[PDB]
């Protein structure tokens with residue numbers, strides 16, 4: 001597997017829930033970057049070096065993803081809920097001496113990030129979420145058209161071992177089709193082939209695929225319920241926030257993303273970027289710029 | 298080899314403009330067509346067909362593209378596997394036997410063929426029974442988080458090819474057996490005759506047969522929905538005397554829903570999961586015999 005972060009160090013950080021793997025680079029204010037599905041920390045490789053010119057950049061594998069440990073799940077999928085992932089990543093940052101930091105997340109990692117902001121706003125100076133609406137908002141928008149357009153939220157959330165067994169026969173095909181289909185152009189051209197190999201190797205491990213299904217099971221159940229409590233309480237994130245999304249991604253599928261986030265946060269700015277669902281790879285210069293500008297302000 | 302589960306029934310290949318329909322044919326008296334659903338074949342009727350054939354001429358057909366029926370070549374709109382098209386093909390098949398007015402009971406996908414048949418060509422039917430369904434339009438109208446999770450396969454199997462085909466190919470025996478078990482009251486395969494399960498497994502083992510099933514669900518998400526929506530908007534109701542049966546463990550009651558779609562409908566829950574004719578054969582046969590008599 002290629003080293004896509006030339007000069008960055010590597011850390012295996014202990015937490016009560018297992019080790020978090022991270023690449024670490026740069027210097028300055030602390031900035032944690034969190035990937036999503038079906039990727040690993042290396043999805044940040046085209047923006048992390050630029051960010052590292054201004055920040056101490058921590059590029060972490062989510063709990064159970066990449067090279068992070070995989071805690072055993074339970075009937076409520078607890079370790080792969082965004083609430084639990086956020087707690088674990090807070091522990092990991094404390095191991096490095098970071099008790100207040102900047103955070104940008106993409107996809108599942110962005111879900112960890114806004115949940116972190118709702119549960120523990122004191123931990124964050126500023127927050128960026130990329131290519132998402134809150135989990136509650138996707139489920140509220142569930143109708144025939146949305147069900148057909150983003151089937152995998154219900155598919156991967158089916159009780160084990162149904163999706164696990166379906167994914168086993170030809171995992172390469174499934175993950176490569178997902179990566180391609182969620183891009184602007186519908187192919188793999190937006191990705192560094194070396195990055196695709198990272199994603200493919202991760203997805204080739206049945207234990208890693210099980211974690212991804214547990215992630216989506218949490219997304220269908222406890223994560224949704226946690227979100228529901230906040231929205232029905234009128235709780236908003238007070239942390240200064242940035243929302244970025246690909247204009248061809250599913251966050252804007254049947255919604256105006258900045259309007260959605262204004263329901264969830266009291267100090268949020270936002271913008272689209274011409275891209276599918278993989279902003280930091282499809283539009284790295286624009287993404288990196290928007291992030292540097294936001295976290296520097 | 299596969300077991301013969303229809304003693305006294307003949308085996309017929311019926312010609313149509315779209316391909317042969319396979320059927321087991323038994324009994325005498327008024328004609329009654331029985332239509333199965335997914336992921337099964339005509340053999341799911343093996344426990345209630347004999348009771349029915351006591352009073353009726355019973356035709357137990359494989360749906361177009363299913364079981365031993367031929368597989369018509371599909372198209373971009375999944376036309377031959379739309380319920381409108383399947384109904385036209387089965388009407389042609391019945392005409393080959395000289396049946397132009399007949400009784401009809403369907404289950405699951407076959408029940409969707411059946412109410413679509415009734416909407417398009419009510420003159421074909423004396424009486425109609427539908428087992429364990431609501432109209433396709435109603436399912437999609439109900440498709441919120443709870444339903445998206447419960448009947449995920451309506452969206453999964455409808456994804457553009459080859460996504461579901463590719464996934465189903467790895468271990469088809471597990472998928473079909475899990476579907477069969479998961480939709481019963483028992484949660485296992487104990488409600489089924491193992492010989493019937495082998496019929497379902499063998500059919501599902503064929504990639505061409507699984508592709509047909511995905512085309513069926515693609516039609517269900519698109520053209521079938523639009524056909525239903527036209528009727529809903531026009532206020533069209535089925536005039537054919539109608540019976541709706543459903544499994545009690547498989548919102549407005551089903552009969553409340555069917556009364557919006559039909560002007561003469563009776564109905565009853567039976568303690569059962571989805572597969573009424575196998576989980577609750579005696580009660581299903583008795584209810585059908587009484588209805589169709």
Ligand SMILES: [Cl-]
Pocket residue numbers: 334405406430
């Ligand atoms: Cl159905």
